[PDB]
Amino acid sequence: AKKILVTCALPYANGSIHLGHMLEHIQADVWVRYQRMRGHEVNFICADDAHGTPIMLKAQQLGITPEQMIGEMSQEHQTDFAGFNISYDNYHSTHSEENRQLSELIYSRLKENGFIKNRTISQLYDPEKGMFLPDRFVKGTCPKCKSPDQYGDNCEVCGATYSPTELIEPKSVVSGATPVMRDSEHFFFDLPSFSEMLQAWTRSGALQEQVANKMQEWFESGLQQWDISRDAPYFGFEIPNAPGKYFYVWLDAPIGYMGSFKNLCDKRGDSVSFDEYWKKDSTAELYHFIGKDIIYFHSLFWPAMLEGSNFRKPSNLFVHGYVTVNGAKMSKSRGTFIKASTWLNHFDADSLRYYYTAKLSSRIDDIDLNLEDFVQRVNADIVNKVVNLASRNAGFINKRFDGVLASELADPQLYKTFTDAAEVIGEAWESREFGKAVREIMALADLANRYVDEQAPWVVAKQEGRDADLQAICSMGINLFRVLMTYLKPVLPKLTERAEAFLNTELTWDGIQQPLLGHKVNPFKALYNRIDMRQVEALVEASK
Ligand SMILES: [Zn+2]
């Protein structure tokens, strides 16, 4: 009955999708698929974050327009996400008319409401190229240790940090020219005016405890005003009434959440849903799945901007930790910085979806992809626990019973044990306690395989006169498989499709209450094959 709008953070347009992005998009997709299974109206919304100085400069380096470059990367990203079955209702771009109109609208309301301040700043400027330089486009000699060729605000030899204005013999990374200090008028969002409102959000109990604790540190330090403008030359949207000034990504990137939804509504010819979801009086739910590095933005700047422009605020923020591989941050030299596209050359999507889901929880702790454990766990749980219930039983049904399952459950009390677990498992999906859900599902899978072992169909099948017993045993196992695959349907979309083809039925959450009786199933080739460490080694080699 609920109306739910769910986002993931917008991938930056100047890098390929990697396993860190995939943790976030898979986590959100599992949640979204569960919510759809429970009958809710769900809109899963994302987009590429496509503006700014690094994008402008990279396109100039490539000798193509920024529009061409971001279009190519948007296609690459969407191809990768589609390969992992991320079920967006719309994937748009911050470089869009919807985002331009919403950025202009929000800015105009913030300004009319007194929340935009003008301030003159001083920044390093490349007088040959004719542009202000972000810190990382200034290089020079470390003032402390005198090491040459250091970039931005820190030295990678001695570890010192300093303003780039302290670098010795500074050079523009863009042109090689010596930069100079130049003043410019910038426009700032008066975030400190929302401090009391934001403090009340933190105490409310909606947010992850770990997230609320971080916000307390930020209130202690004191909220600052945030620059929302950039000078030309820029790739982005110009500020009304301010020639030569553009919206900085702080302002336009999250508006892409709104612009992507507006695009979806407009393409559908739906003239009511945008306001229904984003007006202050909305009864729809708004959730953002994000990582640890963007908590401050989404918990402080973003709700303040929405409040100040007369829009509703997020219902909650769902924050996850970082991905590690083999216990450490992804490492290019070790081949553990793994692209989504590369992953799919070696493994299917369901394997990684399962592995991350088995590790995920409602906390912000990091998620480790241990590659040895990945092989062991996929083979143990998918191949040998869940799919085994179908593969060990379906042959007898197809070959000796014309594909027809028994007319009654052999063990109705065991079946009820499995259906009774739906409440706790669904609550675990709902609360983002994914690891708890998987543990419960796999405990049931162990109980199902225990049942089959106890009945010993490989013995019954060779014994004269026991056809009916064999059909009963094997049909019971297949019905337990039906239930387990329903619980795993948010996690394993492709395996689920194969299971539905075998079972001749769509799997629905409520459908488990009606077992398959006197019901024709289909033959299948392997539903899921084993993986091995040779494939892991190949993936690692390919990623170096
Ligand atoms: Zn140094």
Coordinates of C-alpha atoms and ligand atoms in Angstrom, one line a residue:
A1 CA 0.0 0.0 0.0
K2 CA 3.0 2.2 0.5
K3 CA 4.5 4.7 -2.0
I4 CA 8.3 4.5 -1.8
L5 CA 11.0 6.4 -3.7
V6 CA 14.4 4.8 -3.3
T7 CA 17.8 6.1 -4.6
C8 CA 21.4 5.1 -4.8
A9 CA 24.1 7.7 -4.9
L10 CA 24.8 8.9 -8.4
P11 CA 27.9 7.4 -10.0
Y12 CA 30.4 9.9 -11.1
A13 CA 30.6 10.1 -14.9
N14 CA 34.4 10.0 -15.1
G15 CA 35.1 6.5 -13.8
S16 CA 34.0 2.9 -14.5
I17 CA 31.7 1.0 -12.1
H18 CA 33.6 -1.1 -9.6
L19 CA 32.8 -3.5 -6.8
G20 CA 32.3 -0.7 -4.4
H21 CA 29.5 0.8 -6.4
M22 CA 28.1 -2.7 -6.8
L23 CA 27.8 -3.2 -3.0
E24 CA 25.5 -0.1 -2.8
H25 CA 23.5 -0.9 -5.9
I26 CA 23.0 -4.6 -4.9
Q27 CA 22.0 -3.7 -1.4
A28 CA 19.4 -1.3 -2.6
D29 CA 18.2 -3.6 -5.3
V30 CA 17.6 -6.5 -2.9
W31 CA 15.6 -4.2 -0.7
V32 CA 13.6 -2.8 -3.6
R33 CA 12.8 -6.2 -5.0
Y34 CA 11.5 -7.3 -1.5
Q35 CA 9.4 -4.2 -1.2
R36 CA 7.9 -4.9 -4.7
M37 CA 7.2 -8.5 -3.6
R38 CA 5.1 -7.2 -0.7
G39 CA 2.9 -5.2 -3.0
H40 CA 4.2 -1.6 -2.6
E41 CA 4.5 1.1 -5.2
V42 CA 8.3 1.4 -5.5
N43 CA 10.3 3.8 -7.6
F44 CA 14.0 3.0 -7.7
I45 CA 15.8 6.0 -9.1
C46 CA 19.4 6.8 -10.1
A47 CA 21.5 8.8 -12.6
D48 CA 25.0 9.7 -13.5
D49 CA 26.6 12.7 -11.8
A50 CA 27.9 14.3 -14.9
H51 CA 29.0 17.9 -14.2
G52 CA 32.1 19.7 -13.1
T53 CA 35.7 20.8 -13.7
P54 CA 37.3 17.3 -13.8
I55 CA 34.8 16.2 -16.4
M56 CA 35.3 19.3 -18.4
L57 CA 39.1 18.9 -18.4
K58 CA 39.0 15.2 -19.2
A59 CA 36.8 15.8 -22.2
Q60 CA 39.2 18.5 -23.4
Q61 CA 42.1 16.1 -23.0
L62 CA 40.3 13.5 -25.1
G63 CA 39.4 16.1 -27.8
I64 CA 35.7 15.4 -27.5
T65 CA 32.7 17.3 -26.1
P66 CA 31.8 16.7 -22.5
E67 CA 28.4 15.7 -23.8
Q68 CA 29.9 13.0 -25.9
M69 CA 32.1 11.7 -23.1
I70 CA 29.4 11.6 -20.4
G71 CA 27.0 9.9 -22.9
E72 CA 29.5 7.1 -23.5
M73 CA 30.1 6.7 -19.8
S74 CA 26.4 6.7 -19.0
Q75 CA 25.9 3.8 -21.5
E76 CA 28.9 1.9 -20.0
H77 CA 27.5 2.3 -16.5
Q78 CA 24.0 1.3 -17.4
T79 CA 25.3 -1.8 -19.3
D80 CA 27.2 -2.8 -16.2
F81 CA 24.3 -2.3 -13.8
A82 CA 22.0 -4.2 -16.2
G83 CA 24.4 -7.1 -16.1
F84 CA 23.9 -7.2 -12.4
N85 CA 20.1 -7.0 -12.7
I86 CA 19.8 -3.7 -10.9
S87 CA 16.1 -3.0 -11.4
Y88 CA 15.9 0.8 -11.7
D89 CA 12.6 2.4 -12.7
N90 CA 14.7 5.3 -14.2
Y91 CA 18.4 6.0 -14.7
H92 CA 18.8 9.6 -15.8
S93 CA 21.6 12.2 -15.7
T94 CA 22.3 15.4 -13.8
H95 CA 23.0 16.9 -17.3
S96 CA 19.3 17.2 -18.1
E97 CA 16.6 19.8 -18.5
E98 CA 14.7 18.4 -15.5
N99 CA 17.8 19.0 -13.3
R100 CA 18.4 22.5 -14.8
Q101 CA 14.9 23.6 -14.0
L102 CA 14.9 22.1 -10.5
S103 CA 18.3 23.5 -9.7
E104 CA 17.2 27.0 -10.8
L105 CA 13.9 26.6 -8.9
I106 CA 15.6 25.5 -5.7
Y107 CA 18.2 28.2 -5.9
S108 CA 15.6 30.9 -6.5
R109 CA 13.6 29.8 -3.5
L110 CA 16.7 29.6 -1.3
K111 CA 17.7 33.1 -2.4
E112 CA 14.2 34.5 -1.9
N113 CA 14.1 32.9 1.6
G114 CA 17.4 34.5 2.6
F115 CA 19.6 31.4 2.6
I116 CA 22.1 32.5 -0.1
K117 CA 25.0 34.7 0.9
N118 CA 27.5 36.3 -1.4
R119 CA 31.2 36.3 -0.3
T120 CA 34.4 37.1 -2.1
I121 CA 37.0 34.3 -2.0
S122 CA 40.6 34.1 -3.1
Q123 CA 41.8 31.1 -5.1
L124 CA 44.8 30.0 -7.2
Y125 CA 44.2 30.8 -10.9
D126 CA 45.8 29.7 -14.1
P127 CA 46.2 33.0 -16.1
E128 CA 47.2 31.1 -19.3
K129 CA 44.4 28.6 -19.4
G130 CA 42.2 31.3 -17.8
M131 CA 40.6 29.3 -15.0
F132 CA 40.5 28.8 -11.3
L133 CA 42.4 25.7 -10.2
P134 CA 41.0 23.1 -7.8
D135 CA 43.6 22.0 -5.4
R136 CA 44.5 18.8 -7.2
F137 CA 45.3 20.7 -10.4
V138 CA 48.1 22.6 -8.6
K139 CA 51.5 20.9 -8.3
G140 CA 54.8 22.0 -6.9
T141 CA 57.4 21.5 -4.3
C142 CA 56.6 20.5 -0.7
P143 CA 57.4 23.4 1.6
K144 CA 58.5 21.1 4.4
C145 CA 60.7 18.4 2.9
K146 CA 61.3 20.1 -0.5
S147 CA 60.2 17.0 -2.5
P148 CA 59.2 18.0 -6.0
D149 CA 56.1 17.1 -8.0
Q150 CA 53.6 17.1 -5.2
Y151 CA 49.9 17.7 -5.9
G152 CA 47.3 19.6 -4.0
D153 CA 47.3 20.0 -0.3
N154 CA 49.6 17.1 0.8
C155 CA 53.0 15.6 0.2
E156 CA 53.3 11.9 -0.6
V157 CA 56.9 11.7 0.6
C158 CA 56.8 13.3 4.1
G159 CA 53.1 13.3 4.7
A160 CA 52.8 17.0 5.4
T161 CA 49.5 18.8 4.7
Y162 CA 49.3 22.5 3.7
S163 CA 47.4 24.9 1.6
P164 CA 48.4 24.6 -2.1
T165 CA 49.4 28.3 -1.7
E166 CA 52.4 27.1 0.3
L167 CA 53.8 25.0 -2.5
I168 CA 57.2 26.1 -3.8
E169 CA 57.4 27.0 -7.5
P170 CA 53.7 26.0 -8.1
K171 CA 52.6 25.0 -11.6
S172 CA 49.2 24.5 -13.1
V173 CA 48.6 20.9 -13.9
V174 CA 46.5 22.1 -16.9
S175 CA 49.0 24.3 -18.7
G176 CA 52.2 24.4 -16.7
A177 CA 51.8 28.1 -16.1
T178 CA 52.6 29.5 -12.6
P179 CA 49.2 30.2 -10.9
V180 CA 48.4 33.4 -9.1
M181 CA 45.9 34.3 -6.4
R182 CA 42.7 35.9 -7.8
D183 CA 39.5 37.0 -6.1
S184 CA 36.0 35.9 -7.2
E185 CA 32.5 36.4 -5.8
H186 CA 30.9 33.1 -4.7
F187 CA 27.4 32.3 -3.5
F188 CA 27.1 30.2 -0.3
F189 CA 24.2 28.3 1.2
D190 CA 23.6 29.3 4.8
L191 CA 23.5 25.8 6.3
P192 CA 24.1 27.1 9.8
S193 CA 20.6 28.6 9.8
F194 CA 19.2 25.0 9.9
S195 CA 21.3 23.8 12.9
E196 CA 18.4 23.5 15.3
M197 CA 16.2 21.7 12.8
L198 CA 19.0 19.3 11.9
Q199 CA 19.8 18.6 15.6
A200 CA 16.2 17.5 16.1
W201 CA 16.5 15.1 13.2
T202 CA 19.6 13.5 14.7
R203 CA 17.9 12.9 18.1
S204 CA 14.8 11.4 16.5
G205 CA 16.0 7.8 16.4
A206 CA 15.3 7.3 12.6
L207 CA 18.9 7.3 11.6
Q208 CA 21.5 4.6 12.1
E209 CA 22.9 5.1 15.6
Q210 CA 26.4 5.1 14.1
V211 CA 25.4 7.9 11.7
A212 CA 23.7 10.0 14.4
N213 CA 26.8 9.8 16.5
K214 CA 28.9 11.2 13.7
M215 CA 26.5 14.1 13.3
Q216 CA 27.1 15.1 16.9
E217 CA 30.8 15.5 16.2
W218 CA 29.8 17.8 13.3
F219 CA 27.5 20.0 15.4
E220 CA 30.4 20.3 18.0
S221 CA 32.8 21.5 15.3
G222 CA 30.1 24.0 14.1
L223 CA 28.3 24.0 10.8
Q224 CA 29.7 26.2 8.1
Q225 CA 28.2 27.9 5.0
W226 CA 28.8 25.9 1.8
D227 CA 29.9 27.3 -1.5
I228 CA 27.3 26.4 -4.2
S229 CA 28.9 28.3 -7.1
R230 CA 31.8 28.0 -9.6
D231 CA 33.2 30.4 -12.2
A232 CA 33.4 29.8 -15.9
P233 CA 34.8 27.9 -17.7
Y234 CA 32.7 25.1 -16.4
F235 CA 30.6 22.1 -17.5
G236 CA 27.3 22.5 -15.8
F237 CA 24.3 24.9 -15.4
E238 CA 24.6 28.7 -15.3
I239 CA 23.2 30.6 -12.4
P240 CA 20.3 32.8 -13.2
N241 CA 21.1 36.6 -13.1
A242 CA 24.8 35.7 -12.5
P243 CA 26.7 35.7 -15.7
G244 CA 29.9 33.6 -15.7
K245 CA 28.7 31.7 -12.6
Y246 CA 27.6 28.1 -12.5
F247 CA 26.0 25.8 -9.9
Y248 CA 28.6 23.7 -8.1
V249 CA 27.9 20.0 -7.7
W250 CA 26.8 20.3 -4.1
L251 CA 23.7 22.0 -5.4
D252 CA 23.0 20.1 -8.7
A253 CA 24.2 16.5 -8.0
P254 CA 21.5 15.6 -5.4
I255 CA 18.9 17.5 -7.4
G256 CA 19.5 14.7 -9.8
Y257 CA 17.5 12.4 -7.5
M258 CA 14.5 14.8 -8.1
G259 CA 15.3 15.3 -11.8
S260 CA 15.5 11.6 -12.5
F261 CA 12.0 11.1 -10.8
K262 CA 10.6 14.1 -12.7
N263 CA 11.9 12.6 -16.0
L264 CA 10.2 9.3 -15.1
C265 CA 6.9 11.0 -14.4
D266 CA 7.1 13.1 -17.6
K267 CA 8.0 10.1 -19.8
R268 CA 5.0 8.3 -18.3
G269 CA 2.6 11.2 -18.9
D270 CA 2.0 11.3 -15.1
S271 CA 1.3 14.8 -14.0
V272 CA 0.6 14.2 -10.3
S273 CA 3.2 11.8 -8.9
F274 CA 6.2 14.3 -8.7
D275 CA 4.4 16.6 -6.4
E276 CA 2.8 13.7 -4.5
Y277 CA 6.3 12.5 -3.6
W278 CA 8.2 15.7 -3.1
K279 CA 5.7 18.2 -1.6
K280 CA 6.1 19.0 2.1
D281 CA 2.8 17.2 2.9
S282 CA 3.9 14.0 1.1
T283 CA 2.8 10.7 2.6
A284 CA 5.2 8.8 0.3
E285 CA 8.5 7.5 1.8
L286 CA 11.9 8.7 0.5
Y287 CA 15.0 6.7 1.2
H288 CA 18.6 7.2 0.1
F289 CA 21.1 4.4 0.0
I290 CA 24.6 5.9 0.5
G291 CA 28.1 5.2 1.6
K292 CA 30.0 6.5 4.6
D293 CA 31.9 9.2 2.7
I294 CA 28.8 11.1 1.9
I295 CA 26.9 11.1 5.2
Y296 CA 27.6 14.7 6.1
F297 CA 26.1 15.9 2.8
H298 CA 23.0 13.8 2.9
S299 CA 22.3 14.3 6.6
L300 CA 22.9 18.0 6.9
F301 CA 23.2 20.0 3.7
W302 CA 20.6 18.0 1.7
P303 CA 17.7 18.1 4.3
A304 CA 18.4 21.8 4.9
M305 CA 18.3 22.6 1.2
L306 CA 15.0 20.7 0.8
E307 CA 13.5 22.5 3.8
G308 CA 14.7 25.9 2.6
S309 CA 13.1 25.3 -0.8
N310 CA 9.7 24.0 0.5
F311 CA 10.2 20.3 -0.3
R312 CA 9.9 17.2 1.9
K313 CA 13.0 15.7 3.5
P314 CA 14.3 12.1 3.4
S315 CA 12.3 9.6 5.5
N316 CA 15.6 7.9 6.3
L317 CA 19.2 7.4 5.1
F318 CA 20.5 3.9 4.7
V319 CA 24.3 4.0 5.0
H320 CA 26.6 1.1 4.2
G321 CA 30.4 0.7 4.8
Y322 CA 33.2 0.3 2.3
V323 CA 34.1 -2.8 0.3
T324 CA 37.4 -4.5 1.1
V325 CA 38.9 -7.4 -0.9
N326 CA 40.9 -10.0 1.0
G327 CA 40.6 -7.7 4.1
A328 CA 42.2 -4.6 2.5
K329 CA 41.1 -1.6 0.4
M330 CA 41.0 -2.6 -3.2
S331 CA 44.6 -2.6 -4.6
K332 CA 45.4 -2.1 -8.3
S333 CA 48.8 -3.7 -7.9
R334 CA 47.3 -6.8 -6.4
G335 CA 44.5 -7.0 -8.9
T336 CA 41.8 -6.5 -6.3
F337 CA 40.5 -3.2 -7.8
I338 CA 37.9 -5.0 -9.7
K339 CA 35.5 -3.4 -12.3
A340 CA 31.9 -4.6 -12.6
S341 CA 32.4 -5.3 -16.3
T342 CA 35.5 -7.5 -15.5
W343 CA 33.6 -9.4 -12.8
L344 CA 31.0 -10.5 -15.3
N345 CA 33.6 -12.0 -17.7
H346 CA 34.5 -14.5 -14.9
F347 CA 31.4 -14.9 -12.7
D348 CA 27.7 -14.4 -12.9
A349 CA 25.9 -11.5 -11.1
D350 CA 24.0 -13.8 -8.7
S351 CA 27.2 -15.0 -7.1
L352 CA 28.3 -11.6 -6.0
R353 CA 24.7 -10.5 -5.1
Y354 CA 24.5 -13.6 -2.8
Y355 CA 27.9 -13.0 -1.2
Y356 CA 27.4 -9.4 -0.4
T357 CA 23.8 -10.1 0.9
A358 CA 25.2 -12.8 3.2
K359 CA 27.5 -10.2 4.7
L360 CA 25.3 -7.1 4.8
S361 CA 23.5 -5.8 7.9
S362 CA 21.8 -2.6 9.1
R363 CA 25.1 -1.2 10.4
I364 CA 27.7 0.9 8.6
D365 CA 30.6 -1.6 9.0
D366 CA 32.8 -2.5 6.0
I367 CA 32.0 -5.5 3.8
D368 CA 34.8 -7.9 3.0
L369 CA 34.9 -9.9 -0.3
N370 CA 37.3 -12.7 0.7
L371 CA 37.9 -14.4 -2.6
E372 CA 38.7 -17.8 -1.2
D373 CA 35.6 -17.6 1.0
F374 CA 33.6 -16.5 -2.0
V375 CA 34.3 -19.7 -3.8
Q376 CA 33.6 -21.8 -0.7
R377 CA 30.4 -20.0 0.2
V378 CA 28.8 -19.9 -3.2
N379 CA 29.5 -23.6 -3.8
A380 CA 28.4 -24.6 -0.3
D381 CA 25.2 -22.5 0.0
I382 CA 23.9 -22.0 -3.6
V383 CA 25.0 -25.2 -5.3
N384 CA 25.0 -27.7 -2.4
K385 CA 22.2 -26.4 -0.1
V386 CA 19.5 -24.6 -2.1
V387 CA 19.8 -25.7 -5.7
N388 CA 20.6 -29.2 -4.5
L389 CA 17.0 -29.6 -3.3
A390 CA 15.9 -29.2 -6.9
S391 CA 18.7 -31.1 -8.6
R392 CA 18.6 -34.1 -6.4
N393 CA 14.8 -34.6 -6.7
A394 CA 13.8 -33.3 -10.1
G395 CA 15.2 -36.2 -12.2
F396 CA 13.1 -38.8 -10.5
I397 CA 10.0 -36.7 -10.9
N398 CA 10.6 -36.1 -14.6
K399 CA 11.8 -39.6 -15.4
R400 CA 9.5 -41.8 -13.3
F401 CA 6.4 -39.6 -12.7
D402 CA 6.0 -37.7 -16.0
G403 CA 7.0 -34.5 -14.3
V404 CA 4.0 -34.6 -11.9
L405 CA 4.4 -33.8 -8.2
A406 CA 2.5 -35.8 -5.6
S407 CA -1.1 -34.8 -4.7
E408 CA -0.3 -34.3 -1.0
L409 CA 2.6 -33.0 1.1
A410 CA 4.6 -35.9 2.6
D411 CA 5.4 -33.9 5.7
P412 CA 2.9 -31.0 6.3
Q413 CA 4.4 -30.1 9.7
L414 CA 7.9 -29.6 8.1
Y415 CA 6.3 -27.5 5.4
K416 CA 4.6 -25.3 8.0
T417 CA 8.0 -24.8 9.7
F418 CA 9.2 -23.3 6.4
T419 CA 6.2 -21.1 5.8
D420 CA 6.1 -19.9 9.4
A421 CA 9.6 -18.5 8.9
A422 CA 8.3 -16.0 6.3
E423 CA 7.5 -13.4 9.0
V424 CA 11.0 -13.3 10.5
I425 CA 12.8 -13.5 7.1
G426 CA 10.6 -10.7 5.6
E427 CA 11.3 -8.6 8.6
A428 CA 15.0 -9.2 8.1
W429 CA 14.8 -8.0 4.5
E430 CA 12.7 -5.0 5.5
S431 CA 15.1 -3.9 8.3
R432 CA 18.2 -4.5 6.0
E433 CA 19.4 -7.3 8.3
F434 CA 20.3 -9.2 5.1
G435 CA 22.8 -11.5 6.8
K436 CA 20.2 -12.5 9.4
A437 CA 17.8 -13.4 6.5
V438 CA 20.4 -15.5 4.7
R439 CA 21.3 -17.3 7.9
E440 CA 17.6 -18.2 8.5
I441 CA 17.2 -19.3 4.9
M442 CA 20.3 -21.4 5.0
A443 CA 19.3 -23.0 8.3
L444 CA 16.0 -24.0 6.6
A445 CA 18.0 -25.3 3.6
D446 CA 20.0 -27.5 6.0
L447 CA 16.7 -28.8 7.5
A448 CA 15.4 -29.6 4.0
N449 CA 18.5 -31.5 3.0
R450 CA 18.4 -33.3 6.3
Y451 CA 14.8 -34.4 5.5
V452 CA 15.9 -35.7 2.1
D453 CA 18.9 -37.5 3.6
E454 CA 16.7 -39.1 6.2
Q455 CA 14.3 -40.4 3.5
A456 CA 17.1 -41.7 1.4
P457 CA 15.6 -41.5 -2.1
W458 CA 18.8 -43.1 -3.6
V459 CA 17.7 -46.2 -1.6
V460 CA 14.0 -45.9 -2.1
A461 CA 14.5 -45.6 -5.9
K462 CA 16.0 -49.0 -6.2
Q463 CA 13.5 -50.8 -4.1
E464 CA 10.6 -52.8 -5.6
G465 CA 7.1 -51.3 -5.1
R466 CA 8.2 -48.0 -3.6
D467 CA 7.3 -45.7 -6.5
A468 CA 4.7 -43.7 -4.4
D469 CA 7.2 -43.2 -1.6
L470 CA 9.8 -41.9 -4.0
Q471 CA 7.4 -39.5 -5.6
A472 CA 6.3 -38.2 -2.2
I473 CA 9.9 -37.7 -1.0
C474 CA 11.0 -35.9 -4.2
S475 CA 7.9 -33.7 -4.4
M476 CA 8.4 -32.7 -0.7
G477 CA 11.9 -31.6 -1.5
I478 CA 10.8 -29.6 -4.5
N479 CA 8.2 -27.8 -2.4
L480 CA 10.8 -26.9 0.2
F481 CA 12.9 -25.6 -2.7
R482 CA 9.9 -23.5 -3.9
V483 CA 9.7 -21.8 -0.5
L484 CA 13.5 -21.2 -0.2
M485 CA 13.7 -19.7 -3.7
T486 CA 10.8 -17.3 -2.8
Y487 CA 12.8 -16.1 0.2
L488 CA 15.9 -15.7 -2.0
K489 CA 14.0 -14.1 -4.9
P490 CA 15.2 -10.5 -4.0
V491 CA 18.7 -11.8 -3.9
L492 CA 19.1 -14.0 -7.0
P493 CA 17.0 -12.8 -9.9
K494 CA 18.5 -15.0 -12.6
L495 CA 18.5 -18.2 -10.6
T496 CA 14.9 -17.3 -9.6
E497 CA 13.9 -17.1 -13.3
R498 CA 15.4 -20.5 -13.9
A499 CA 13.6 -21.9 -10.9
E500 CA 10.3 -20.4 -12.0
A501 CA 10.8 -22.0 -15.4
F502 CA 11.4 -25.4 -13.8
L503 CA 8.5 -25.0 -11.4
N504 CA 6.1 -23.7 -14.0
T505 CA 5.1 -20.9 -11.6
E506 CA 5.9 -17.3 -10.7
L507 CA 7.2 -17.1 -7.1
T508 CA 5.1 -14.8 -4.9
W509 CA 5.6 -14.1 -1.2
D510 CA 2.0 -15.2 -0.4
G511 CA 2.1 -18.1 -2.8
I512 CA 4.1 -20.3 -0.5
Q513 CA 0.9 -20.9 1.5
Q514 CA -0.3 -23.1 -1.4
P515 CA 2.2 -25.9 -2.1
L516 CA 2.5 -27.3 -5.6
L517 CA 0.3 -30.4 -5.6
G518 CA -0.7 -32.5 -8.6
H519 CA 1.4 -30.1 -10.6
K520 CA 3.6 -30.5 -13.7
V521 CA 7.2 -29.3 -13.5
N522 CA 9.7 -29.1 -16.4
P523 CA 13.1 -30.6 -17.0
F524 CA 16.1 -28.4 -16.6
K525 CA 19.8 -28.2 -17.4
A526 CA 22.1 -27.2 -14.6
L527 CA 20.4 -24.5 -12.5
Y528 CA 23.8 -23.4 -11.0
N529 CA 27.3 -24.7 -11.5
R530 CA 30.2 -24.8 -9.1
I531 CA 33.0 -22.2 -9.2
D532 CA 36.7 -22.6 -8.4
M533 CA 39.8 -20.7 -7.4
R534 CA 41.2 -20.9 -10.9
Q535 CA 38.5 -18.5 -11.9
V536 CA 39.4 -16.2 -9.0
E537 CA 43.0 -16.2 -10.0
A538 CA 41.9 -15.3 -13.6
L539 CA 39.8 -12.4 -12.3
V540 CA 42.7 -11.1 -10.3
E541 CA 45.2 -11.4 -13.2
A542 CA 42.7 -9.7 -15.5
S543 CA 42.3 -6.8 -13.0
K544 CA 46.0 -6.0 -12.8
Ligands
ZN1 ZN 57.0 16.8 2.0

